[PDB]
Subunit: 28 residues, 4 copies
């Protein structure tokens, strides 16, 4: 549970990296 929580946080960071990468792509 401590672990699953940190996993969820991890995955939210990867969704935020995905956003950054979609943005740089749309701008081009």
């Amino acid at each position: 549970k401590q672990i699953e929580d940190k996993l969820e946080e991890i995955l939210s960071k990867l969704y935020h990296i995905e956003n950054e990468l979609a943005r740089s792509k749309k701008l081009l």
Copy 2:
């Protein structure tokens, strides 16, 4: 079960980011 699911989502996000960056590289 939940943890495993999250681990697999995480990894699969990492494969996508990796391939989006390699694709980017290539068009540039």
Copy 3:
């Protein structure tokens, strides 16, 4: 203990990638 360590390395890698992409954005 090991797991926690790895979780913290992982998260900290994600913060760095996020900030390297935001920095990139900004210079572009």
Copy 4:
């Protein structure tokens, strides 16, 4: 242990994303 292993794999993917990002930076 199954978990720590997958964490190690996760982190190796983040080192590989880091490489991709150092490369795109050196090329500029």
